[PDB]
Design an enzyme around this catalytic site. Structure first.
Site, PDB file in Angstrom:
ATOM      1  N   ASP A  20      -4.460 -82.257 -22.035  1.00  0.00           N
ATOM      2  CA  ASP A  20      -4.208 -81.218 -23.024  1.00  0.00           C
ATOM      3  C   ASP A  20      -5.529 -80.543 -23.373  1.00  0.00           C
ATOM      4  OD1 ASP A  20      -1.421 -81.826 -23.207  1.00  0.00           O
ATOM      5  OD2 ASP A  20      -1.898 -83.499 -24.550  1.00  0.00           O
ATOM      6  N   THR A  31      -6.323 -78.446 -26.553  1.00  0.00           N
ATOM      7  CA  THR A  31      -6.680 -78.539 -27.966  1.00  0.00           C
ATOM      8  C   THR A  31      -7.058 -79.957 -28.384  1.00  0.00           C
ATOM      9  OG1 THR A  31      -5.400 -76.622 -28.730  1.00  0.00           O
ATOM     10  CG2 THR A  31      -5.799 -78.384 -30.319  1.00  0.00           C
ATOM     11  N   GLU A  74     -13.382 -67.395 -39.591  1.00  0.00           N
ATOM     12  CA  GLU A  74     -14.245 -67.173 -40.743  1.00  0.00           C
ATOM     13  C   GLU A  74     -15.160 -68.366 -40.990  1.00  0.00           C
ATOM     14  OE1 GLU A  74     -12.087 -66.015 -44.244  1.00  0.00           O
ATOM     15  OE2 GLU A  74     -12.454 -63.892 -43.819  1.00  0.00           O
ATOM     16  N   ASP A 110       0.308 -87.117 -27.293  1.00  0.00           N
ATOM     17  CA  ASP A 110      -0.026 -87.448 -28.676  1.00  0.00           C
ATOM     18  C   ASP A 110       1.206 -87.707 -29.542  1.00  0.00           C
ATOM     19  OD1 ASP A 110       0.632 -84.722 -30.224  1.00  0.00           O
ATOM     20  OD2 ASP A 110      -0.375 -84.204 -28.345  1.00  0.00           O
ATOM     21  N   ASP A 163       5.898 -86.744 -25.757  1.00  0.00           N
ATOM     22  CA  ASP A 163       5.038 -87.048 -24.622  1.00  0.00           C
ATOM     23  C   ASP A 163       5.280 -88.459 -24.093  1.00  0.00           C
ATOM     24  OD1 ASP A 163       3.820 -84.515 -25.046  1.00  0.00           O
ATOM     25  OD2 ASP A 163       2.477 -85.412 -26.534  1.00  0.00           O
ATOM     26  N   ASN A 219     -21.345-116.499   4.964  1.00  0.00           N
ATOM     27  CA  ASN A 219     -20.632-117.701   5.381  1.00  0.00           C
ATOM     28  C   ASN A 219     -20.096-117.592   6.804  1.00  0.00           C
ATOM     29  OD1 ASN A 219     -21.125-118.124   2.667  1.00  0.00           O
ATOM     30  ND2 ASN A 219     -19.142-119.101   2.281  1.00  0.00           N
TER      31      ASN A 219
END
Ligand SMILES: [Ca+2]
Ligand SMILES: [Ca+2]
Ligand code: NA
EC number: 7.2.2.10
Length: 994
Positions: free
Chosen positions: A351, A353, A442, A703, A707, A768
């Site tokens: 994902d 984000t 902002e 999440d 899902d 060996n």
């Protein structure tokens, strides 16, 4: 507490004598944990096939070896001949060596047990409780939950233990009992008792059965039963101690185990069979029995020496330590069998984000006007570090840190960003992280101002809470914001009318700071600010500014740009319409251009690097976002999924486009796709399905509940630490970071763990192999034997002990992410790898026998110089006119055996250095890359030095101290095993792959 559903809340609270407003006291918790145990099912007996066929088999071997030693020890008494010494101490030495083997074995087991125990700390604390210790809620491991403590649950949580509901804090409480009763339809709960003691779980609507999911709500309750007493624990009790599902690698190892058992058994019987003609040798007394017993003691000793012991402990140790490093890097892998799968990850579907990007808008670029001359201008472009809302970062000019106060234009730029802003910054003391207060675009300006700090305000000795809005407040104390002209979509900008703070001059110093879309703002700019001065806006200047804005928004970064302007002489407030947004553009005219800021949603830490690591590792990366196709592609180009200039018409699909494709075309899409934008939660399952149809080991991120189906279906389910507990249950790994980089790190560690196993196997088998070759080489040719039973046990102790174990502590290989993902279908040992075993083994076996024959055939400064037939040495007492001043007992000299033993031990210590990496040179991977290995070699060499030079020791091993000249001969023949492997490494590195 059984039948807690039958009893009331008060009755249940009284049963353990606990207040739901306090919780259990430490005295209660200690006693309850003692009496009830933990909330889990008992670990099934891990008696692997390797243990029975190899470990238990070798145990029998050392017992029948000691027995065969005990037998001849008794026969030695009846020997009327001279009472020998060395053959008298044979059973003692053997047992003494076996004691040492047990000590080394215990250390290995203790290492594994400790490494496993260390993983319990990083266990995900999925469970909230109330105890007498804190008056607040506490996060505690699920298994550490005892019946009696007060547990709080909420939405998206998996029920830890069987809990009697005490109080529902929300309006309703929905639980998903599909894992038990058999219905995805969430059921509603209550607190009233269920009077019928013999009622089914479907009618027990006041209990929270463990394993179930909380669909909605928030409730408080008390634990009734934990562990096997659980209603689902009794259901899970079915496949508890009785199951049959081994991992692909476990199957290969067990298969490889049987193969070794058969091979070792045959070659040892072969040794006993090809030496039947020596059963009646005069060195054996002429007795057929005494001769057969001796060669029996050799074969079994050869078996013990050849058998690769410690493999289960070493693998478990690497697995546990490696998992710890994952958890150390915020990669919480729940089930250990997932690690080998995690190392085979071929496709990662992540994902965007929060995982690929920080989801925190950040200003990373800004420029002001440098100089203006002849109607042309130069710019001062700056770059800002930091990718979160935290006031942590630097302002750079030409990749070099600068102070914003050094530029008068930057002082005004920060002024505009701090005043033309309705948002602010806050520090969440609970979560220990800065959070935005308002629009993201902002807050990016707010965070920028704090990073800039144009007035050099002392902030180093400030708290996190005070630091959040430090520099922004400094500016606000200089300029008073009168009012704010709201944003209008017809002009795509906004502005604020401000005035000097603490000023008696009411009509002097008033300004208007404007921000918005570049084109609209710049068009309304008649002036250009240069420092503190201004010059008329000209054509070439305006064209120069727009060009850079164009580049920033069209380039690889694709920055969202904003123009920052100031009206030096704003209209009177008594002449401004404040209830008509269409009048605002007029007020924002005759402006002065100050600068431009560029912001984005920046990739997380080391994500762009991790993406490139995937391409190097042949691991496909697929982005699953919720943005439009156009932007999603731009984000992919930004982070490195797509190139700056690559066609993406066939590698990027939306939910709309993907559903328009038929099945064969949908499956074909996922084969080449790298970006999925705005997709339904069901699409994740379809993507996994199509990827699995191409034999891709798929990793999917999630999440939420939506899902969970895709997380189960995918080979590596990856849930977010910030995500719901339901998704964590359906996943193979949990990201504490939520960062994509963590996934890649976890994959690399998985590849590392596997490689340490291979280098461990390569060292033991190859070394060996030579041990077996050595015994056969001196037998097939006819040379005098080089090794005796106790010497074989010595090599086993020295070479297969600590040096072998230390190879598990090897650092991650250099080209670990330069190789394609390992296919689970591939054999444990490839053909070329098998050749490498025979190559190194073929030499160490010959170099051992050759060193012994060196004392006979091309003897240098030593007795016994015969380049002729050593084959028929048993005929030396038959045809004597072949020697010259040398007895026939010089064939029985302890000199060649000491050479053969010293070389064999040393050349394998060399071979241990060859096992520092699979294909990388020692020149690139130095011997001091593993301190634990070197210490083991020093220890092993010390023991060998101990035997040869401490007088009572070389008597029982039939050895003699080697001269300094004779030891330099050992290194001369042992060291070239490095070069041989070095060539083999070079070949596989520069031809078999690239
Ligand atoms: Ca061995
Ligand atoms: Ca060995
Ligand atoms: Na899964």
């Amino acid at each position: 507490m059984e039948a807690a559903h039958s009893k009331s809340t008060e009755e249940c609270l009284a049963y353990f004598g606990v207040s739901e407003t306090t919780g259990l006291t430490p005295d209660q918790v200690k006693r309850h944990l003692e009496k009830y145990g933990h909330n889990e099912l008992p670990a099934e007996e891990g008696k692997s096939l390797w243990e029975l066929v190899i470990e238990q088999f070798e145990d029998l071997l050392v017992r029948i070896l000691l027995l065969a030693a005990c037998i001849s020890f008794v026969l030695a008494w009846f020997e009327e001949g001279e009472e020998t010494i060395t053959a008298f101490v044979e059973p003692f030495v053997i047992l003494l060596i076996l004691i040492a083997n047990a000590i080394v074995g215990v250390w290995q087991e203790r290492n594994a047990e400790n490494a496993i125990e260390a993983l319990k700390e990083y266990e995900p604390e999925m469970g909230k409780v109330y105890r007498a210790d804190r008056k607040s809620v506490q996060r505690i491991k699920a298994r550490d939950i005892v019946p009696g403590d007060i547990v709080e649950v909420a939405v998206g949580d998996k029920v830890p233990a069987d809990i009697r509901i005490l109080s529902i804090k929300s309006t309703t409480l929905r639980v998903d009992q599909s894992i038990l009763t058999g219905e995805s339809v969430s059921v509603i709960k209550h607190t009233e008792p269920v009077p019928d003691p013999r009622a089914v779980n479907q009618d027990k609507k006041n209990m929270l059965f463990s394993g179930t999911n909380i669909a909605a709500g928030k409730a408080l309750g008390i634990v009734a039963t934990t562990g096997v007493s659980t209603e689902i624990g009794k259901i899970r009790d079915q496949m508890a101690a009785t199951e049959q599902d081994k991992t692909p690698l476990q199957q290969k190892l067990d298969e490889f185990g049987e193969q070794l058992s058969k091979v070792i058994s045959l070659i040892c019987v072969a040794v006993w069979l090809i030496n039947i003609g020596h059963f009646n040798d005069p060195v054996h007394g002429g007795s057929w029995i005494r001769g057969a017993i001796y060669y029996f003691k050799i074969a079994v000793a050869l078996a013990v020496a050849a058998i690769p012991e410690g493999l289960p402990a070493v693998i478990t140790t690497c697995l546990a330590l490696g998992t710890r490093r994952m958890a150390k890097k915020n990669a919480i892998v729940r089930s250990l069998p997932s690690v080998e799968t995690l190392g085979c990850t071929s496709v990662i579907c992540s994902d965007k984000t929060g995982t690929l990007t920080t989801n925190q808008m950040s200003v990373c670029k800004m420029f002001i006007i440098d100089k203006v001359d002849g109607d042309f201008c130069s710019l001062n472009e700056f770059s800002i570090t930091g990718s979160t809302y935290a006031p942590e970062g630097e302002v750079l000019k030409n990749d070099k840190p600068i102070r914003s106060g050094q530029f008068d234009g930057l002082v005004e730029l920060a002024t505009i960003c701090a005043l033309c802003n309705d948002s602010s910054l806050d520090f969440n003391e609970t979560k220990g992280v800065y959070e935005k207060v308002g629009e993201a675009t902002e807050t990016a300006l707010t965070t920028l101002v704090e990073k800039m700090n144009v007035f050099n305000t002392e902030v180093r000795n400030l708290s996190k809470v005070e630091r959040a809005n430090a520099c922004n407040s400094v500016i606000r104390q200089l300029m008073k914001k009168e009012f704010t002209l709201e944003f209008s979509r017809d002009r795509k900008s906004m502005s604020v009318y401000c005035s000097p703070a603490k000023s008696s001059r009411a009509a002097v110093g008033n300004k208007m700071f404007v921000k918005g879309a570049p084109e609209g703002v710049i068009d309304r700019c008649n002036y250009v600010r240069v420092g503190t001065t201004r010059v008329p806006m000209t054509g070439p200047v305006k064209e120069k500014i727009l060009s850079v804005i164009k580049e920033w928004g069209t380039g690889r970064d694709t920055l969202r740009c904003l123009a920052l302007a100031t009206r030096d002489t704003p209209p009177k407030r008594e002449e401004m319409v404040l209830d008509d947004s269409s009048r605002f553009m007029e007020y924002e005219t005759d402006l002065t251009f100050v600068g431009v800021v560029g912001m984005l949603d920046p990739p997380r830490k080391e994500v762009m690097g991790s993406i490139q690591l995937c391409r190097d590792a042949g691991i496909r990366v697929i982005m699953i976002t919720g943005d439009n196709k156009g932007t999603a592609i731009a984000i992919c180009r930004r982070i490195g999924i797509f190139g700056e200039n690559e066609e993406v018409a066939d590698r990027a699909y939306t939910g709309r486009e993907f559903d328009d494709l038929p099945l064969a075309e949908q499956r074909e899409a996922c084969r080449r796709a790298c970006c999925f934008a705005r997709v339904e939660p069901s699409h994740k399952s379809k993507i996994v399905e199509y990827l699995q149809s191409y034999d891709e080991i798929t990793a999917m991120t999630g999440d939420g509940v939506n899902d969970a189906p895709a997380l189960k279906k995918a080979e590596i389910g990856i849930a977010m630490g910030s995500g719901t507990a339901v998704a964590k249950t359906a996943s193979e790994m949990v990201l504490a970071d939520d960062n994509f980089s963590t996934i890649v790190a976890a994959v690399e560690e998985g590849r590392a763990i596997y490689n340490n196993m291979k280098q461990f196997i390569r060292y033991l088998i190859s070394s060996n192999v030579g041990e077996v070759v050595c015994i056969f080489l001196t037998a097939a040719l006819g040379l005098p034997e080089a090794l005796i039973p106790v010497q074989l046990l010595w090599v086993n102790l020295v070479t297969d002990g600590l040096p072998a174990t230390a190879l598990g502590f090897n650092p991650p290989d250099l080209d670990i992410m330069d190789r394609p993902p390992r296919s689970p279908k591939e054999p444990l040992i490839s053909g070329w790898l098998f050749f490498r075993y025979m190559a190194i083994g073929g030499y160490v076996g010959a170099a051992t026998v050759g060193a012994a024959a060196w004392w006979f055939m091309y003897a240098e400064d030593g007795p016994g110089v015969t380049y002729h037939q050593l084959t028929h040495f048993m005929q030396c007492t038959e045809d004597h006119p072949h020697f010259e001043g040398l007895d026939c007992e010089i064939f029985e000299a302890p000199e060649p055996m000491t050479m053969a033993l010293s070389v064999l031990v040393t050349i394998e210590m060399c071979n241990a250095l060859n096992s520092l990496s699979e294909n990388q040179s020692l020149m690139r991977m130095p011997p001091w890359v593993n301190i634990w290995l070197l210490g083991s070699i020093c220890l092993s060499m010390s023991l060998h030095f101990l035997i040869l030079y401490v007088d009572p020791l070389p008597m029982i091993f039939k050895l003699k101290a080697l001269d300094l000249t004779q030891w330099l001969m050992v290194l001369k023949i042992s060291l070239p095993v490095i070069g041989l492997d070095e060539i083999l490494k070079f070949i596989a590195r520069n031809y078999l792959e690239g």
